Amino acid sequence: EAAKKEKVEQILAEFQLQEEDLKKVMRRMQKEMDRGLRLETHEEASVKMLPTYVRSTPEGSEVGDFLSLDLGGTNFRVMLVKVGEGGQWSVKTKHQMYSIPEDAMTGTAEMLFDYISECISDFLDKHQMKHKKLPLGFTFSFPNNVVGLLRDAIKRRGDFEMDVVAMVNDTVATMISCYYEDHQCEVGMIVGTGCNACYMEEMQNVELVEGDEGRMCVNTEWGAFGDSGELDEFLLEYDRLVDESSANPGQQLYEKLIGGKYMGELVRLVLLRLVDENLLFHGEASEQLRTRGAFETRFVSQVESDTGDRKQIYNILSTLGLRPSTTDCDIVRRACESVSTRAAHMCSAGLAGVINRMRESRSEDVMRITVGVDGSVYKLHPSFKERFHASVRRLTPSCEITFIESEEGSGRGAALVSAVACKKACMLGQLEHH
Ligand SMILES: CS(=O)(=O)c1ccc([C@@H](CC2CCCC2)C(=O)Nc2nccs2)cc1
Numbered sequence: 060e061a062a063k064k065e066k067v068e069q070i071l072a073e074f075q076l077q078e079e080d081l082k083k084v085m086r087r088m089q090k091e092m093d094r095g096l097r098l099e100t101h102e103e104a105s106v107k108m109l110p111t112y113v114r115s116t117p118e119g120s121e122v123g124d125f126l127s128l129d130l131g132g133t134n135f136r137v138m139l140v141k142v143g144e145g146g147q148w149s150v151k152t153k154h155q156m157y158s159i160p161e162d163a164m165t166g167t168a169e170m171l172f173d174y175i176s177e178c179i180s181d182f183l184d185k186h187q188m189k190h191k192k193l194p195l196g197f198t199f200s201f202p203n204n205v206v207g208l209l210r211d212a213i214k215r216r217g218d219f220e221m222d223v224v225a226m227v228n229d230t231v232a233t234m235i236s237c238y239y240e241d242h243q244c245e246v247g248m249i250v251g252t253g254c255n256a257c258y259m260e261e262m263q264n265v266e267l268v269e270g271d272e273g274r275m276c277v278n279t280e281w282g283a284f285g286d287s288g289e290l291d292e293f294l295l296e297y298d299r300l301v302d303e304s305s306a307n308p309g310q311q312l313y314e315k316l317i318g319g320k321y322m323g324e325l326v327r328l329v330l331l332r333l334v335d336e337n338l339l340f341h342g343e344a345s346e347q348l349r350t351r352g353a354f355e356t357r358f359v360s361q362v363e364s365d366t367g368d369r370k371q372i373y374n375i376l377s378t379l380g381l382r383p384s385t386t387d388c389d390i391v392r393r394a395c396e397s398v399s400t401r402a403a404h405m406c407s408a409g410l411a412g413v414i415n416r417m418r419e420s421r422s423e424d425v426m427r428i429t430v431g432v433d434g435s436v437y438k439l440h441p442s443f444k445e446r447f448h449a450s451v452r453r454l455t456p457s458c459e460i461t462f463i464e465s466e467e468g469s470g471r472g473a474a475l476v477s478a479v480a481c482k483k484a485c486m487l488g489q490l491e492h493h
């Protein structure tokens with residue numbers, strides 16, 4: 060009836076966050092960023108603000124030739140990159156795509172990397188680059204760590220040497236690949252399974268490094284924001300439950316509000332509360348619905364994609380052992396919207412904090428800035444992006460923000476990620492042959 064509808068909305072309204080609540084979160088983010096950057100508070104800081112050593116200017120001159128290896132869904136690409144400084148860097152690329160033959164043995168990671176190493180060997184032969192002992196970086200283009208696996212497989216072969224360099228953080232790969240397309244890109248963010256951001260900070264503010272001139276990318280690791288109690292007043296019963304059953308209770312609390320790792324589980328616990336109150340599924344949950352992890356984050360995106368006929372919603376609930384009414388389906392859609400909208404708003408406060416801080420750190424007036432973004436939630440969820448953009452903009456009055464997602468293009472954005480990875484390894488003295 061009408062009382063039931065009202066009660067559902069009363070429960071779902073606990074998820075709402077007011078502009079004033081988001082301004083609070085935003086200022087507290089700014090305060091935690093300041094703490095992670097300072098030598099005296101770095102150890103107690105929740106938000107670690109890791110120096111990435113990626114500078115706004117070119118470094119590692121010595122590295123002018125390198126390999127980039129792009130791992131896709133089913134294929135991989137080996138690319139030879141040559142940087143010329145005879146300008147704004149002159150880049151030649153030569154490449155080859157490889158598919159796995161059906162007869163190849165790829166049952167283990169070791170087996171797959173044996174195959175990959177063999178293709179690298181062939182490629183190095185075709186281009187006469189074997190004796191050069193080039194550095195190599197990884198990139199990913201998906202629809203045990205790879206650096207270690209490749210290093211081990213190349214050693215097993217014993218016919219060539221390479222320096223396989225450390226990867227940059229995914230937020231940093233995102234910033235660099237987007238920077239390739241738009242030089243005003245100075246923020247990288249990921250809203251996927253996890254959530255994090257990086258940005259270009261003034262060297263003088265990065266106390267953990269030597270030097271007061273220029274800018275360096277800083278990896279906030281902001282998923283741990285709240286870990287000193289900063290978010291406690293916003294935590295709901297569902298958040299406390301998610302935290303309790305997690306691998307790390309008490310930690311990554313900000314990430315637990317936003318990330319795809321937990322978003323479906325939040326909705327599951329909301330649905331169980333509405334069931335316990337006799338407001339949903341005639342007050343009976345299935346065995347599947349009472350199972351941790353059963354409501355997948357992808358179901359949240361799918362529910363919110365429903366055209367209005369509730370057919371997609373029904374089919375999800377059916378597979379979870381339920382026989383929903385039309386009202387049940389609509390309540391489930393509202394529960395999803397509630398959880399996902401909160402994730403967008405919490406995320407928006409963090410990015411607003413970063414952006415407003417940069418404007419303050421630099422200001423000559425209206426700050427015009429490009430933010431590069433990737434991740435499954437940001438890209439696949441039907442309305443997260445729109446809600447997130449609207450909220451960030453409300454919180455950043457004196458800024459003009461352009462959001463961008465990198466495209467594959469000819470693979471030159473990925474080449475720049477690998478150039479930076481290899482030149483960073485050079486500068487840090489990590490190359491055993493360069
Ligand atoms: C204009 S340019 O000359 O082509 C040019 C090429 C690369 C850089 C930077 C990387 C950019 C991507 C995002 C931040 C700036 C760089 O090599 N930083 C490094 N830091 C450590 C090793 S390499 C700057 C200018």
Ligand SMILES: OC[C@H]1O[C@H](O)[C@H](O)[C@@H](O)[C@@H]1O
Binds near residue numbers: 249256
């Ligand atoms: O994948 C997005 C993010 O997830 C987690 O927060 C990781 O700690 C961080 O390093 C990563 O950038």
